[PDB]
Every structure is written in C-alpha cells, then in structure tokens.
C-alpha cells in the first residue's frame, strides 16, 4: 500500500524561562524513528526505532544540526507572531510545523505537504501543487508574502519530490522487517448484561499493524450505527494497535448481530459472532 | 532525512 514520512516540530513559549520548549519527532507510516527535545541533556537527534540506528555519524550530525537550527527559527517565530497579534509577553503560545511525503504502493511520489499552525489553528500551508500557499488571516498573509519573495516553495518542492521520497524508500528497505510487516488483528468478543432488557457485545481487535482498521456491526446482515460506539484506535506500546466496537442489543437477540473486521493483514474480511 | 539546512522565519 501507501507509505508516508512525516516530521513534526512543536515549540511552546515559556515567559519567565530562558527559551521555549522545542520537541521534534519523525515517523515512517505509524512508526516513530527519531526525536529531539531542546530541554534534554544530549542535545542530539536520537534514534527511536532499531532500523535508523545503522545510519552513520554524518547522518546523525546533519540531522542534529538541522533540528537544532529549526528550534531557533521556531523561537523567533513565537516572537514574530506574538508581535503580529499584539499579544502579551506574559502568555504561553505554540507554533507547530509538519511536513512530509507519501508514496503509493508502487513506491512512486504521490504527494507532499507542509502545514504550520499558531496556537493550534491553521496559519499557513503549502497547496498540493507545491507552488503556492494558503494563509489563514492577515498575519499569515504577511508571512506568505515573505515566503513567496524568498522562493520557499521551490526549495520545499525540490525536497518533497526528491530527497524526502528517496529517503523514505531507503527507510522502508532498511526497516523492511518491521515497516513492511502487517500484523493481523487477534480478534475476540465480549458480552456483558447492561440493562435487564439489554446487553453489550464488544468486538475486539488486538496487536495489529498498521493502525488503519475498520470495525462495523451488522444486524441481520444490515449495518448498524444505533446504540453502537467505536473507540479511537490506541497504541499498545509495543508497535501494535488496539480498537474495539460495541453494540447494545435487546437481550436474547445476540445471534442477529455480527461484527465485521477489515485490515490489510487479513486476506478476507472477518465475521465474528457471539458464541455463548 | 529532514529538509535543510534550515527554515526561513515566519
């Protein structure tokens, strides 16, 4: 299927401390592979997956130089946007940047993206053509003019279409064992009496990778949304994911209901039934 | 591998 490489850079203002807190993380698909924390002692980009550990010192020196430089421009941007919005130096604010590239299942370039947010709201983004910007308000218009005049989109489009997609492919290969695996969901059903007239059936998917999964309930072969609920997919902490979907049913009718599971690691969609 | 060497300010 498709794959993505994405980098995430958060900086939080802290009036009364020396500098903002800056945290960067990189991911291939759903797997984290590097981090940087401005407050930590090492002052280096650090490995967070086994397959990037094989990268040599030139890689690590460069990645660390780039991420440290990025912490300084986030720091400046916090001051600039504060000024743009005429906001007090007393408050804490946030800047966020994310960028990345996707490849298809053929592993060719599918798309690139770059988005920036101030206080958790869209500020400026690169459009999908990778040539133009969308600005949320007049402040962001001042930024956009600055970035057009500097030819930022050209630099970024060269990277997104070339380097980003090349190194993604490099990582998919070097981490093939863990990154190109699919772990099929372990699947079971649960039952609890809720109300004298009713019971909950909960269909579980466990230890799966990637995170993408769909769980649906049917009654008599007919999709249900009423009295259903689906939890947000959650990390297990070991590289795999979990999810469940529940339905409450009139008690005595459990056999009308069926839970349906689709995941890339399943040759065919699973159907589960409560078996008392 | 990150875009670099670095970013323009906002």
């Amino acid at each position, epitope marked *: 299927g498709s794959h993505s490489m994405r980098y995430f850079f958060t900086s939080v203002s802290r009036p009364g401390r020396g500098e903002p807190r800056f945290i960067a993380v990189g991911y291939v698909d759903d797997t984290q592979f590097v981090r940087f924390d401005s407050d930590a002692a090492s002052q280096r980009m650090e490995p967070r997956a086994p397959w990037i550990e094989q990268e040599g010192p030139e890689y690590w*020196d460069g990645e660390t*130089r780039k991420v*440290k430089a990025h912490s300084q421009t986030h720091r*400046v941007d916090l001051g600039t946007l504060r000024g743009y919005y005429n906001q007090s130096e007393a408050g804490s604010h946030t800047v966020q940047r994310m960028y990345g590239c996707d490849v298809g299942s053929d592993w060719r370039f599918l798309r690139g993206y770059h988005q920036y947010a101030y206080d958790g709201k869209d500020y400026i983004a690169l459009k999908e053509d990778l040539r133009s910007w969308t600005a949320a308000d007049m402040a962001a218009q001042t930024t956009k003019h600055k970035w057009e005049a500097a030819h930022v989109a050209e*630099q970024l489009r060269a990277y997104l279409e070339g380097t980003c997609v090349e190194w993604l492919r490099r990582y998919l290969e070097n981490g093939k064992e863990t990154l190109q695996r699919t772990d099929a969901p372990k699947t079971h059903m649960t039952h609890h009496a809720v109300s004298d007239h009713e019971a909950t059936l909960r269909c579980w998917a466990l230890s799966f990778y990637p995170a993408e999964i769909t769980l649906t309930w049917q009654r008599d072969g007919e999709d249900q949304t009423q009295d259903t609920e689906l939890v947000e997919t959650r990390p297990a902490g070991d590289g795999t994911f979990q999810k469940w979907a529940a339905v409450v049913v009139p008690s005595g009718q459990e056999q009308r209901y069926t839970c349906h599971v689709q995941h890339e690691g399943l040759p065919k969609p699973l159907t589960l039934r409560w078996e008392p | 591998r990150q875009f*670099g060497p670095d970013w323009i300010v906002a």
Partner: T-cell receptor
Amino acid sequence: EVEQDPGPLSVPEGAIVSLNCTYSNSAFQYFMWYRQYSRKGPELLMYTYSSGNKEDGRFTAQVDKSSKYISLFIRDSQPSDSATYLCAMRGDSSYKLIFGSGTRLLVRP
Amino acid sequence: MDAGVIQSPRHEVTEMGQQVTLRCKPISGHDYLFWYRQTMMRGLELLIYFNNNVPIDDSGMPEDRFSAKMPNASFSTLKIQPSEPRDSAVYFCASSLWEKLAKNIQYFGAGTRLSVLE
C-alpha cells in the same frame, strides 16, 4: 574534498577560458564560483543547483553530477578578469562551503 | 548607502604567545554570521557560522586555542589564545539572510590580515 588545478593560466585578451573542479562527495548539491582579486575578498559569480548549465553574459557555469565535474567558461576574456577563481560547494545539511584551492588567471592585454 | 560588514582590525602584526581578538559587525538585520580564513597552505575555509547568535556548524574550528562568540546580533568575536605563527592568515567575516543564502549569496567584510611572528 575538491580538486582544482592552480594554474596559473595565461591567455591573450579575447580568449575563451575554461576553469574546472572535481569532487568526490555525492552529497554535494550546490555549486558556486567566485572571483577574488589579489588582496581582496571573494565575489560570487554563478551558482547552480541541478546538474545543468547556466549562462550570464560572458560566463557559463556547468555541473555534471555523474562525472562530479563542474566548470566555468569565460567568453571574450578581458584584462579585468585577471584574478583567482575558486569553486565552492555544499550539501543541504549546513551552509558550510568547501572551496577548491583556486586557479589563477592572467588575461594579457 | 547602508554599511556593509565591518571587521576590525584591518591589520594585525603581533608576537606569538599573545591573545588575538578579531571582531565583526554584520549588516544590521542579517541573522547569519560566518567566519572564514584563507592561507597560502590550506586555501579558503569556513571556521564557524552562527544563526540567531547560536553556533550551528563549528566543524572547521581548530580544536584548540580558537574560540568564537556572538554575544548579540550586532557583534561577533573570534579569539585566538595563545597565538602561533601558523595562525597567520586573512580572516573574513560574512553575513547573510535565508533568502540570500538560498541563492548562495553572503556579504563579506574587507578581512583582517593577521601575522603572528616568532
């Protein structure tokens, strides 16, 4: 690391001059040329990103990333082109430039 | 027009064993600052550069006796202590901005010509 022949080159006014550098590190992606007059600082002439060719007046800079070979051509050379010519290059992890050792050109009036 | 990069001193002739201080004021508004040296033996080479007053790449700094600081956006110093004859060179300061660096432009000062004598 970048190799550059020191010359000196001596050419008559009006000649085409060819300067070049060779490099080893395939991570280099930005390639520049400078002129420096003796006892002064370096002045950028031409800059190229992609493996490819750029003209500006009498100057043409070229890069061949397969051969790792870059060159600068000066058409219709003038006495005032008499200078040391340096090439420089970098990647995208740092603004640090690596320079060749320079080639001295004397254009004879 | 506006000042370009100003370096000082223009010339320094000094005995080895002493401390030498090279100074640079970058063009006002510029937020990158580069220190280079140039010698007959080793050519033209970057010692260090700063962005927003912080050292980004010092891989070209000699491992002993050289120190570079940028205490504020208008002033950088490079110090050598104790100096040695092999430190003799022309030292150049340059400044720039992101949008200029993306076209490989930087602005050079006039240089400090340093001779350290036995």
